[PDB]
Amino acid sequence: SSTHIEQFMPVKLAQALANSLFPELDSQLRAGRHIGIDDLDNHAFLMDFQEQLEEFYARYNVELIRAPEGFFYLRPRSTTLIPRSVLSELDMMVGKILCYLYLSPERLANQGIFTSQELYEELISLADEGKLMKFVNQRSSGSDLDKQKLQEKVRTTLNRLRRLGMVYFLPNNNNKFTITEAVFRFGADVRSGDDPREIQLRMIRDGEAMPV
Amino acid sequence: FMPVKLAQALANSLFPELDSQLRAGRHIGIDDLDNHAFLMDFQEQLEEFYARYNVELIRAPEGFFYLRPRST
Amino acid sequence: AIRVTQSDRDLFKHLITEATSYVSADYMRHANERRTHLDEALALRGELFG
Amino acid sequence: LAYMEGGALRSMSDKALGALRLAVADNEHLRDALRLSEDPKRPERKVQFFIAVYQHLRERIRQDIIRTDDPVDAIEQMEIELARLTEELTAREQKLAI
Amino acid sequence: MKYQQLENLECGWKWAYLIRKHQEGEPITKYIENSAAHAAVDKLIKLESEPVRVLEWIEQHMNPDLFNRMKQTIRARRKRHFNAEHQHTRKKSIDLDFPVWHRLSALSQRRGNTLSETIVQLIEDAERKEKYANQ
Amino acid sequence: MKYQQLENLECGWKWAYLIRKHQEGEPITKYIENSAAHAAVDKLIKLESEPVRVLEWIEQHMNPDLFNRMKQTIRARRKRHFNAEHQHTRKKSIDLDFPVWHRLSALSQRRGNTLSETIVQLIEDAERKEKYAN
DNA sequence: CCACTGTTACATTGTAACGGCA
DNA sequence: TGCCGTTACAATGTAACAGTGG
DNA sequence: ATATATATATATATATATATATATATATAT
DNA sequence: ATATATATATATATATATATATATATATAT
Structure with a gap:
């Protein structure tokens, strides 16, 4: 009959969109924030009405995607109604390193709580110090001023990732943080045991990762 | 539940583009005939929908619509 | 977790037992009447031939 | 059941259907299959519905360790898990009291 | 009694008959007031998955007119259901000028x-x- | 063509048939999405008392696979309606063992x-x- | 007696398959 | 071919008659 | 013929939720 | 190195719903 919700929208989708949690979750998602198991309320909300939200967001030409690790996010399409952006290469370095720390048992004593200094030390341990520094400044040759510049850049990238939900600052401390499973996306190019050059094409075709 | 007319307005195929442009701060005037008519018709419900975001859907005296963010 | 797992176990048990009870009974019935009808039919066939 | 006669089989099938009606009201397509299974001209329908029931409980498995997709097999693993959770609950309530 | 009476089957038949009659627009309820009739019908609808309570709903709100038609229809349905097992007991419908x-x-x-x-x-x-x- | 077709009658027949099918659960409309199907069904429901627009409704939202069934149902309805006037043209239905x-x-x-x-x-x-x- | 059951003779609506005809 | 009459069913609902046992 | 119990209306003030304004930390960019 | 933008938290005032206690008129036991 008329004046009846099923005329325009499914009942469960309307119930989900009328829930008190919908607005904060939608604003965060459109901002690019990933959702992990830690946000128990938001994660459960996404799980319960997961299908309604993928079909709703499809209207924006963006896929609400749940990675096998269990974290939801948004991937815009080429015809996205919501703009799209790509992380910096330094952001990739810090995200890969963050995934390593999530999987690294040596730092188990930290119990998941990490400081930016430790992250930088691990980054320089695994990466090429000076050749990575080259991107921070084209004229760097190990100068300690440029060293501090790279430290500051790493801190800034860490803050941006915090904005993306890959990392949480502690309820009182902004100098310490706890990693989230979302960081696993930084390894999507290696989660499959195949040739790297074919997986990169598969991902870029899927829209997962553009090149630089 | 949800208001019925609010569901009708949200379901309308014009809603995604208009919503994106509003959340981007764009002002919808009389020139955008379809969007302006849609907002005119469904203002009573979009005001509540965007007040759920602690934002105000304002129709200026000139007529154009826009979103004013609150402190929250 | 305990509540959810207990509910799941009870539901599985009840569904499985009731479905088996519902189906196997009629299956055995149909089998028994099939045997009986075959037995009945043989005698008619034998008499008819002569 | 081979010994009994048709009347008892019919009666117990009716009782099983009565239990099912309560046990199936939540589901829509499974309930519809149960309803269709009632036609006497097509006994095979019954079996189909039975399959559906399995085809239902297969998807209700929670995580990988309980993926003994044979539903009758998952019961033992689930009972083991209930017993385990009982011990953890005892420990946890002791901890909360202290 | 020649045909075995099954309670959980005849109850479902009765519930389906009541619902069909109502949706056809007939006044299955014995109530002339609109509100009580609507409430009784709603309760009957809730009784979908509980055919056992349908007998009680009948004894409380069924229209007195329908006892004869009810007892006729379910009797005929029982006969047809039990005859449908075998072809030689079935019936064939034909039309004649x-x-x-x-x-x-x-x-x-x-x-x-x-x-x-x-x-x-x-x-x-x-x-x-x-x-x-x-x- | 043996029986003349009357629009205000056959259209009421079609409306009743479609409402019956919808009440029976048959998918009247070609829209898989439930919202569009419900909207079309509501349009039909409020469309009562209209031949010239129920015909258009059929042309626009009718399920493709039901066209033949509806056509033959209306054929039979027309024939029975015209034959039911006289006794000798009526048909008697019986059941044979x-x-x-x-x-x-x-x-x-x-x-x-x-x-x-x-x-x-x-x-x-x-x-x-x-x-x-x- | 009275009630409940089994059975026959319909009606009512829907559907698939033939065959005629533009 | 696609419409249109026509047949032969299927499924369900009812009235009427005949039986049966309490 | 009386006084107490009831129902009604009213102001009091208690609490919640909202919305505003200011201070703070601090992360960016020239 | 510092101007500037942004997010968060707190205090403060508004507006509304609601429970409490009292005042007034009527009903009914004494």
Whole structure:
């Protein structure tokens, strides 16, 4: 009959969109924030009405995607109604390193709580110090001023990732943080045991990762 | 539940583009005939929908619509 | 977790037992009447031939 | 059941259907299959519905360790898990009291 | 009693009959007031998955008119359901033109036997002619 | 064309048939999405008392696979409606036990006649046999 | 007696398959 | 071919008659 | 013929939720 | 190195719903 919700929208989708949690979750998602198991309320909300939200967001030409690790996010399409952006290469370095720390048992004593200094030390341990520094400044040759510049850049990238939900600052401390499973996306190019050059094409075709 | 007319307005195929442009701060005037008519018709419900975001859907005296963010 | 797992176990048990009870009974019935009808039919066939 | 006669089989099938009606009201397509299974001209329908029931409980498995997709097999693993959770609950309530 | 009465089946039949009658627009309820009738119908709807309570809903709100039609329809449905098992007990529905049916019914009422019996006698006379032609 | 078709009658027939099918659960519309199907069904429901627009509704939202069934149902409805005026043109429906029906259909298929023609011929032969004996 | 059951003879609506005809 | 009459069913609902046992 | 119990209306003030304004930390960019 | 933008937290005032206690008129036991 008329004046009846099923005329325009499914009942469960309307119930989900009328829930008190919908607005904060939608604003965060459109901002690019990933959702992990830690946000128990938001994660459960996404799980319960997961299908309604993928079909709703499809209207924006963006896929609400749940990675096998269990974290939801948004991937815009080429015809996205919501703009799209790509992380910096330094952001990739810090995200890969963050995934390593999530999987690294040596730092188990930290119990998941990490400081930016430790992250930088691990980054320089695994990466090429000076050749990575080259991107921070084209004229760097190990100068300690440029060293501090790279430290500051790493801190800034860490803050941006915090904005993306890959990392949480502690309820009182902004100098310490706890990693989230979302960081696993930084390894999507290696989660499959195949040739790297074919997986990169598969991902870029899927829209997962553009090149630089 | 949800208001019925609010569901009708949200379901309308014009809603995604208009919503994106509003959340981007764009002002919808009389020139955008379809969007302006849609907002005119469904203002009573979009005001509540965007007040759920602690934002105000304002129709200026000139007529154009826009979103004013609150402190929250 | 305990509540959810207990509910799941009870539901599985009840569904499985009731479905088996519902189906196997009629299956055995149909089998028994099939045997009986075959037995009945043989005698008619034998008499008819002569 | 081979010994009994048709009347008892019919009666117990009716009782099983009565239990099912309560046990199936939540589901829509499974309930519809149960309803269709009632036609006497097509006994095979019954079996189909039975399959559906399995085809239902297969998807209700929670995580990988309980993926003994044979539903009758998952019961033992689930009972083991209930017993385990009982011990953890005892420990946890002791901890909360202290 | 020739046909076994099954409670959980006849109850479902009765519930389906009531719902069908209501959706056809008939006043299954005994209430003339709109509100009580609507409430009783709503309760009956809730009773979908509990056929056992349908007998009680009948005893509380069923229209007094419907006892005869109810007891007729469920009886016929039971007979048909039990006869449908085997072909030789089934029934076949056919349509006859008015002149043909008039003659056949007059003949049957003359012989004092059912239509199937009259057809049996007729086809048997024809087959007797065929048999004596064959020998 | 033997029976003249009347729009205000056949359109009411079509509306009643579609409402019956929808109430029975049949998918009336071609829209898989539930929202569009419900909207079209509501349009139909509020469309009562209208031939010229129920026809258009059928043309625009009707399920492709139901066209033939609806057409033949309306054919049968028209024929029955026109034949139900006179007694001699009406049709009488009866139920025959399966063996009797099997034998009668065997005869009808053998002789190429219809059930009515076969029974008429047989009754005439029975009367002729009576006269032969009498 | 009275009630409940089994059975027959319809009606009512829907559907698939033939066959005629533009 | 696609419409249009026509047949032969299927499924369900009812009235009427005949039986049966309490 | 009386006084107490009831129902009604009213102001009091208690609490919640909202919305505003200011201070703070601090992360960016020239 | 510092101007500037942004997010968060707290205090403060508004507006509304609601429970409490009292005042007034009527009903009914004494």
